[PDB]
Design an enzyme around this catalytic site. Structure first.
Site, PDB file in Angstrom:
ATOM      1  N   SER A   1       0.781  -1.208   0.000  1.00  0.00           N
ATOM      2  CA  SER A   1       0.000   0.000   0.000  1.00  0.00           C
ATOM      3  C   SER A   1       0.808   1.251   0.000  1.00  0.00           C
ATOM      4  O   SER A   1       0.477   2.182  -0.722  1.00  0.00           O
ATOM      5  CB  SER A   1      -0.902   0.054   1.195  1.00  0.00           C
ATOM      6  OG  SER A   1      -1.833  -0.993   1.122  1.00  0.00           O
ATOM      7  N   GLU A   2       1.820   1.332   0.854  1.00  0.00           N
ATOM      8  CA  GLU A   2       2.660   2.534   0.921  1.00  0.00           C
ATOM      9  C   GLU A   2       3.505   2.705  -0.333  1.00  0.00           C
ATOM     10  O   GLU A   2       3.661   3.823  -0.807  1.00  0.00           O
ATOM     11  CB  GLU A   2       3.563   2.535   2.149  1.00  0.00           C
ATOM     12  CG  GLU A   2       2.867   2.266   3.479  1.00  0.00           C
ATOM     13  CD  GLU A   2       1.897   3.310   3.874  1.00  0.00           C
ATOM     14  OE1 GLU A   2       1.416   4.036   3.020  1.00  0.00           O
ATOM     15  OE2 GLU A   2       1.573   3.424   5.051  1.00  0.00           O
TER      16      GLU A   2
END
Length: 261
Positions: A174-175
């Protein structure tokens, strides 16, 4: 469960980079962007969620379900005995979300077992569980691969073995998709375990503010300089979208018009 698969077990850079372009191409709104940077869609744009399957060197598999609108992980699934075991986060609470999460992950009733995750899906909750700030929990392609084995098909693992795997998977998925900078950090240290540096931490923590800033920029200039931290820890003031632009891959959703380019 027609999903985007990353074979962590035989990962290569070109492989990981294609895995990120896949998420970026399914998660981004088809039309919204600000200064050339794509933006995530509102919550009504279906597909509402994305499924990412992480497969290890023994073909073991773990699928994560993410809200598309923001990239936050909702729960994951593995195979227990001969059944789909869905594990949802304690903070996933709209009653229409945890069921969407349960039936999307494991779509066949009586062929699934639930093993709820008793904690929040958020950095403090997870750091608490592993007992150590995420700055001290390494990241890496072989780290993520092993994590999968501590989980798949075992009935009792430890909330620390699990939170730990999640902290790793959330940043390397996600990051990294939200920030080109984090993806490049992974790729840069592909053949090794590493610690998130001061800037990967500040970016993860600064996602909403960076997105509003860039959405509001007039003629390319931030309406208010932004003080961020850089690699080695020092203040970093960005006054323009082009100062930060190379580091961001996907802007959080902020409703309203911005300079498309």
């Amino acid at each position: 469960i027609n999903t985007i698969t990353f074979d962590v077990g035989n990962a290569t850079i070109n492989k990981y980079a294609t895995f990120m372009k896949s998420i970026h191409n399914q998660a981004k709104d088809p039309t919204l962007k600000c200064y050339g940077i794509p933006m995530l869609p509102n919550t009504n744009l279906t597909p509402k969620y994305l499924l990412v399957t992480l497969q290890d060197s023994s073909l073991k598999t773990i699928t994560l379900m993410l809200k598309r609108n923001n990239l936050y992980v909702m729960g994951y699934a593995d195979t227990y005995n001969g059944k789909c075991r869905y594990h949802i986060f304690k903070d996933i609470s709209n009653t229409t979300e945890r069921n969407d999460v349960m039936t999307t992950l494991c779509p066949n009733p009586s062929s699934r077992v639930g093993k709820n995750i008793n904690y929040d899906s958020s950095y403090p909750a997870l750091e608490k569980k592993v007992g150590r700030p995420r700055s001290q929990v390494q990241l890496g392609i072989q780290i993520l691969n092993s994590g999968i084995g501590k989980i798949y098909g075992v009935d009792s693992f430890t909330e620390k073995t699990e939170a730990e795997f999640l902290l790793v998977a959330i940043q390397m998925v996600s990051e990294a998709a939200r920030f080109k900078y984090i993806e490049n950090q992974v790729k840069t240290n592909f053949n090794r375990a590493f610690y998130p540096n001061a800037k990967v931490l500040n970016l993860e923590e600064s996602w909403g503010k960076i997105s509003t800033a860039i959405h509001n920029a007039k003629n390319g200039a931030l309406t208010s300089p932004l003080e961020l931290k850089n690699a080695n820890g020092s203040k970093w003031i960005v006054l323009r979208v082009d100062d930060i632009e190379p580091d961001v891959g996907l802007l959080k959703y902020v409703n309203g018009t911005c300079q498309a380019t």
